[PDB]
C-alpha cells in the first residue's frame with residue numbers, strides 16, 4: 001500500500017481488510033504471500049569467475065587482435081623445411097599476451113565487495129507479528145512478513161518492513177532513520193495521516209522504515225510494503241546492474257579502436273586496387289593458395305603494427321604506483337580506473353553530516369540573564385570552542401576565556417544540562433576518543449558541563465576516562481535524581497525531579513529542571529533568574545529573550561536552541577501522577593527561566609580551506625544533505641559554498657521543491673544551485689545524473705547508506721574512513737584520514753598522473769603510427785617483409801613499454817591546481833599535434849623500409865640490388881632467363897629485417913625524449929630531468945643488445961648481430977628525428993601559441 005502515509009490508520013486497515021487486535025488470518029497470510037512475495041531484498045552476484053573472462057574477449061581492440069591471432073596459427077602451419085627452425089613462435093606470443101592481459105583485468109575487477117550484501121546487514125533475522133493463528137505475539141522470520149500484517153516493534157529492535165504506525169504503546173516512539181536521512185537524531189513518530197502524497201521520508205512521521213532501528217519505545221503498526229517496494233529496497237534497486245560507465249580516457253581508447261577497426265580494413269583494401277596491372281600474364285608459380293599467403297600475412301601484421309599492445313600493462317603499472325602514493329596520502333583507492341578520472345573532476349557533490357561536519361553535536365553559543373531593569377534587559381552571551389564530544393574547549397565571553405564559575409546563572413544552567421539528561425559521555429580507550437552514550441543532542445550537554453566546570457574542579461591531573469564525566473559527577477552529588485517525567489509531543493519538553501543530597505524524608509527543598517523548545521518552555525515561565533535572584537517575567541524581558549533565540553535559530557547561525565528553566569517550588573510527590581504523561585505539562589508550569597543553549601553539528605576545521613582550493617582549481621562543490629535546508633545553507637556559508645550575505649533564493653532547494661520544478665528547470669538548477677537539503681537517497685543520485693547530462697565528471701563524497709545510490713552513480717565515489725560499510729563498498733575511494741583536504745590532494749594527484757598518462761599514450765600511439773606506414777610501404781612499394789609482427793610484439797611491449805612507464809614519472813607543473821579542469825571530450829591527438837605524429841609516422845615508416853633498402857641499394861656489405869630489380873622479390877626462383885643475379889635467399893635474409901628493427905628502436909628512444917614535453921625544446925626542457933627515463937632507455941638498449949647476442953634470442957626473431965659498421969648509419973637516419981619534431985615544435989610555439 002503506497003501512500004499509506006496520506007491515509008488514516010482506519011483506511012490502511014480497511015485496505016488490507018484486517019483487525020488490529022486479531023491480525024491476518026492464516027488464509028490471508030497465504031494469499032498475501034502469493035501476491036506480494038516474501039519480505040526480502042534479492043541478493044546480487046553477477047561477478048563470477050567465468051563471466052569476467054568472457055568480458056575480456058569482448059573489447060574491440062582485443063577481438064581484432066584475437067582474430068589476427070587465429071589467422072597467425074593457420075598461416076604458421078603452411079611452412080617448408082629449410083626454415084623450420086622457427087615453427088610456431090608467432091601464434092604463441094600473440095595468444096600469450098592476450099591471456100596475460102586478460103588475466104589482469106579479472107584480478108582487478110572480481111575483488112570488490114557487495115554493497116547490497118552490506119546493505120542487507122540492516123535486515124533483521126526475525127520479527128514480531130500478531131496473527132489470527134494465536135493471541136500471543138509470534139516471533140517469526142522477518143521474510144515471512146506480508147503486507148497487511150500486524151507488527152509490533154520494541155526498543156533495540158531493527159524495523160523489518162515499511163510500516164504504517166497504528167498505535168504507540170510508549171509515551172513516544174523515537175526512531176533512528178540514519179540509513180535514509182544520514183542523521184542519527186531520534187525522530188518522534190505519530191499515528192496521524194500525512195496528507196501530502198508527494199511527501200518525502202522526513203515528512204512521513206507516521207511511517208516506520210525497514211533497516212531503521214527503534215531508539216526508544218514500543219509501538220504497533222500495519223505493514224505498508226515489503227521487499228524492494230520499501231525505501232531501503234529503492235536504495236537496493238539503484239545499486240544493481242551496470243552501475244558504472246567507462247573512463248573518459250577509455251572512451252578515447254574505444255574511439256581510437258573504433259576508427260582503427262575501420263582504417264585497418266581500409267588499408268587492406270587499399271593495397272588491392274594498386275595490385276591489378278599484373279594479372280594480364282599468368283605464372284605457374286603459385287595458385288590461389290600460394291598467392292594469398294602474402295595477402296593475409298600482411299593483414300595480421302598490420303593489426304600488430306597498429307594496435308598498441310603492452311599499453312594495458314603500462315597503464316596498469318602507472319595506476320598501481322599512484323595508488324601507493326595516494327595511500328600514503330591517506331586516500332585508499334578501490335578502483336584503479338577512477339584515479340585517472342578523478343583528475344578530470346569539475347563538480348564535487350558532498351554530503352553534509354559526517355562528511356563536511358564532525359557529526360558531533362556541540363554547544364557553541366549560550367546566554368543567561370545579565371540585568372533586568374524596567375523596560376531594559378541585557379543578556380550575558382557566551383561562545384564555546386570545540387567541535388567534538390571531548391571535554392576540550394573554552395567558554396568565551398566576547399572572545400575572552402573566562403571561567404564559568406564566576407557566573408551564578410551558568411552554574412544552574414550547567415546543573416540542568418547535567419541533571420535533566422538521560423545520556424552520558426564515554427571515552428573509548430580502544431579508539432582513544434570520547435564517544436556519546438544516548439542522544440547526541442543530550443551528550444552535547446554532558447560535554448558542555450565538562451567544558452564549563454562551574455566548580456573549578458582540578459581536572460588537568462585526571463585521566464581521559466575520569467575526565468569524561470568528572471564535572472557531571474560533582475553536580476550529581478548535590479541534587480539526587482528522584483524521578484523524571486519523560487518527553488512528550490504536546491509539551492515539547494522534559495523535566496527531572498531532584499532532591500538535595502543527604503536530607504530528611506519530610507523536608508521541602510526539592511527542585512525541577514525543565515528542558516525543551518523555547519516557545520513552549522518560556523511561555524510556561526512566570527519568572528526570570530538573575531544569577532541566584534528571581535524576577536517576574538515581563539514584556540520587554542520576554543521580547544529580548546525571544547529575539548536572540550530567533551537570531552540564533554536563524555540567519556548565519558541557525559542553531560538548535562533549548563530553553564532551560566527550573567521550578568523552584570515543585571508539587572508534592574504524593575500528588576503527582578507519573579503513569580500519565582498528559583499531566584506532565586501541568587507539572588511544568590510556573591517556571592523560572594535560567595538560560596538558553598544553542599547547539600549545532602559543526603563543520604570540520606579544514607573544510608573551508610579545502611573547498612577554496614577546489615574553487616581555485618575550477619571545481620564547484622554542491623551540498624546534498626538529508627538534513628533541513630536551514631542548517632544546510634548555514635553550513636554552506638560557514639565553509640564558503642555561499643557568501644555570508646549572498647542571496648540564495650534560487651541557489652538552494654529542498655527535495656520537495658526540486659520535484660515541483662519541471663524537468664527542464666531541475667536540470668538547470670543543478671548547474672545553478674550548490675545546496676540541496678532534506679533529500680531522499682534517490683535525490684542525490686538524480687542530481688548527479690543531471691550533472692552528468694552536461695558531460696560533467698562529478699564526484700560524490702559521503703559516509704551514510706543514503707549516500708550509496710549517489711556514490712555509485714557518480715564517476716568518483718568517495719567514502720569516509722569512519723563511515724558506513726555500505727558507503728565504502730559503493731565508493732571508488734575511501735578517505736582513511738576522514739579529511740576533505742585529502743580529496744583536494746587526490747585530485748592534484750589525479751591531474752598530475754593524467755598529464756603523464758597523456759604523454760606515453762601519445763608516445764605509444766605515434767609509435768604504432770610509424771609502424772603501419774612501414775608495413776604500408778612494403779605492401780605497396782614492392783619491398784619484401786622489412787618487419788615481421790613477431791618483432792613488433794616485443795617492441796611495443798618491452799622496447800617501448802619501458803620508456804612509456806618512465807614517462808609516468810614526468811615532473812608535473814607547478815600550476816597544476818591553478819588551471820581549470822580539462823574537458824572530458826578533449827582529444828589526445830588534434831591540430832598541429834596531429835600533423836606532427838603524421839609526419840613522424842611517415843618518417844619512422846620510411847626510416848625502416850628505407851634502411852631495409854639501404855642493404856640492397858646504397859649498400860657496402862650487401863648486394864647492389866637497384867630499386868627496379870627489387871620490386872620483383874617473388875620472381876627470383878621462378879624467373880632466371882630474364883632476371884640474372886646472385887642468390888634468392890637474399891630477400892628473406894636476416895640482415896635487412898634487423899637493419900629496419902634497429903632503426904625503429906633507436907627512433908623511439910629519441911622520440912621518447914620528444915614525448916617528455918609537447919611543445920618545448922630539449923634545450924629549454926632538459927632530457928636529464930626525468931632520471932627514470934634515462935635509465936629506461938639504457939635498459940631498453942641493453943635488451944636490444946641482449947636479443948642480438950644470446951643465440952636463443954635472435955633465432956625466433958630472425959635477427960643478425962649488426963656490427964659497428966651499419967650501426968653508424970643508424971645515427972645518421974634515426975638520430976635526426978629530433979630535429980624534425982623540433983622544427984614542428986618551434987613553429988607551433990611561434991605561429992600558433994607559445
Ligand SMILES: C/C=C(\C)C(=O)O[C@H]1C(C)=C2[C@H]([C@@H]1OC(=O)CCCCCCC)[C@@](C)(OC(C)=O)C[C@H](OC(=O)CCC)[C@@]1(O)[C@H]2OC(=O)[C@@]1(C)O
Nearest residue numbers: 252253255256259260306768769772773776828829834837
Ligand atoms: C596507431 C596506428 C595509426 C596508423 C592508426 O591507424 O590510427 C589512426 C586513427 C584510428 C586515429 C589517428 C590515426 O590516423 C592516422 O595516423 C592515419 C592512418 C592511415 C594511414 C596509413 C599509414 C600509411 C591518430 C592515432 O593519429 C595521429 C597520431 O595522427 C590520432 C587520434 O588518436 C588519439 O587521439 C588517441 C586516443 C586514445 C585519432 O584521430 C584516431 O582516430 C580518432 O578516433 C582519434 C581521435 O582517436
Ligand code: ALF
Nearest residue numbers: 182352353625626
Ligand atoms: F549524512 Al547526510 F545527507 F548529511 F546522509
Ligand SMILES: [Mg+2]
Nearest residue numbers: 182353354704
Ligand atoms: Mg553522512
